């Protein structure tokens, strides 16, 4: 998407891994707020909005 027109996905009922994301060198930056990236794999969420 263009930044004026950003595309949102709701992640529905499922099991995840975030370490395949936060350990990947594919990303030039990987910030987090209110959570540590390395700690995501211990948690669960009511939804995720991407």
């Amino acid at each position: 998407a263009s930044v004026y027109a950003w595309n949102r996905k709701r992640i529905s009922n499922c099991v995840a891994d975030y370490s395949v994301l936060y350990n990947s060198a594919s990303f030039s930056t990987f910030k987090c707020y209110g959570v540590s990236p390395t700690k995501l794999n211990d948690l669960c969420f009511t939804n995720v909005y991407a």
């Binding site: 209110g34 959570v35 540590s36 390395t38 700690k39 211990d42 948690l43």
Partner: protein, 49 residues
Amino acid sequence: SALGKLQDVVNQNAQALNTLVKQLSSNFGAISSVLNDILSRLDKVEAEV
């Protein structure tokens, strides 16, 4: 209504304990009032702040 002095000495201490407990639910500028949220959401470098 007669024992107002004694009942007030009971009431002031009950209000003091209930206020001391309610302050466990306050954030004081932290991410959560619940210490187990902070320890389950963050790494030591953020959590100790």
